[PDB]
Design a protein around this ligand. Sequence first.
Ligand SMILES: [Zn+2]
Ligand SMILES: [Zn+2]
Lengths: 55, 56
Amino acid sequence: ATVVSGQKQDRQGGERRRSQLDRDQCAYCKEKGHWAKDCPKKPRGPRGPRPQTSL
Amino acid sequence: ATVVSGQKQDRQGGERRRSQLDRDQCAYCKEKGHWAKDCPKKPRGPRGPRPQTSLL
RNA sequence: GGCUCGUUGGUCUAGGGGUAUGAUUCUCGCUUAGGGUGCGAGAGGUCCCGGGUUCAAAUCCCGGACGAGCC
Ligand SMILES: [Zn+2]
Ligand SMILES: [Zn+2]
């Protein structure tokens, strides 16, 4: 015995997989210097306002 | 119905920066009898001292 | 090595039917000889992936290593 007990979720229902990335790389195309929010692969339109974020 | 996922604790980190300190030795200069907050080398403690030097 | 499916993004956290919270960090200021350290701001999610079930079940039930197919 070690006078201590408890548990952990063992990530059985809490783990995933994602390709090689960093906080200076894009999750959509894997390039460096930007993020998916600015990815050059995207059509960058059309867009506009919505009540859910403007009212 | 019941569920369980372990029997003992786990860790995902630790520390060593505390360097086995004693609350009688300054972390700023290593001298004994005071703390950094009262170091005689600080510009605003324990009594606002100032260093000196020469060139002649 | 190429082609096809790319937007998984703090990290951690128990989760027995419904948006998060807490632990900690990172960035800036104060020192820059501080690890007895702190405080405010900036950075945190419709919280494993797919199929089945009544309005709804992260452990509702089932499969499941670090992906798969073709050249
Ligand atoms: Zn991109
Ligand atoms: Zn000192």
